[PDB]
Amino acid sequence: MKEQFEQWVARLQISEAGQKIIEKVRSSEPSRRVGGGSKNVSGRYPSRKMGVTIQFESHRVALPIIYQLE
């Protein structure tokens, strides 16, 4: 899981700052919890690619992008 990541970074030759920010993203939990607001349907989707739940704040402008990325 980590050796493949390192080889991917080496192949793309990502700078130290970029790899650091990527590791911070892949380690840190989401910054804010999704709130429904007032006109947005919010919620969770099971991403089998990652294998975890992903939060979306809109089911007709952001969720379809999630399906595409899955």
Added chain:
DNA sequence: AAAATGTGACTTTACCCATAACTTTGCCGCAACG
């Protein structure tokens, strides 16, 4: 930090259908005048 869910069982006007009930009105006779 943020766009996308009204809905359906219940009740109510509206038109048609059949019949009762009073008023219309042409088709006929009958009395009166020319």
